Design a protein around this ligand. Structure first.
Ligand SMILES: [Cl-]
Ligand SMILES: [Cl-]
Ligand SMILES: [Cl-]
Length: 163
């Protein structure tokens, strides 16, 4: 575990993270995809061997000894708000189980279903609150990666609010 487990947020490419493992915002078919998934494919392509996994699940594949946790959030274009919410909560619970199993002291994580799977809605708060629900019982340092300046401020505020 980390000595004083924390949450932090950084505005940069998750492929440049300084953590012991990464969470990919994966598609269910283990394809290179777009956004975070394409950056992860360019940095850790070996981790896409047999990475396909259903919506609401996480599957870890090693790139050398570096763990890539493929977490499949729902595409809110295809799911109802209710069912999508349940699958998005489930994907994060599976990430917490993998982080715990791996024994890492730190993890880099994007906000699942906030990009092209958002169904054109702002899901910062929904996705971040499911992240917290899952990760709060873990003792890993969590570093959240984002690309938007306003999102960085809102994520930083939500972390500081609870400290
Ligand atoms: Cl960058
Ligand atoms: Cl997404
Ligand atoms: Cl963002």
């Amino acid at each position: 575990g980390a000595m004083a487990p924390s949450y932090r947020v950084k505005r940069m490419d998750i492929a440049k993270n300084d953590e012991e493992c990464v969470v990919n915002a994966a598609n269910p078919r283990g394809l290179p995809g777009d956004g975070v998934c394409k950056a992860v494919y360019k940095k850790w392509p070996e981790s896409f061997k047999n990475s396909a996994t259903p919506v609401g699940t996480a599957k870890t594949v090693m790139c050398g000894t570096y763990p890539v946790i493929h977490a499949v959030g729902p595409n809110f274009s295809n799911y109802t708000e209710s069912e999508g919410d349940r699958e998005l909560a489930a994907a994060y619970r599976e990430v917490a189980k993998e982080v715990t199993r791996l024994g890492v002291n730190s993890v880099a994580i994007p906000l699942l279903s906030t990009g092209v799977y958002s169904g054109g809605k702002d899901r910062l708060t929904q996705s971040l609150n499911h992240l917290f629900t899952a990760m709060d019982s873990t003792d890993a340092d969590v570093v959240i990666y984002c690309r938007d300046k306003e999102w960085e401020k809102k994520i930083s505020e939500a972390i500081q609010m609870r400290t």
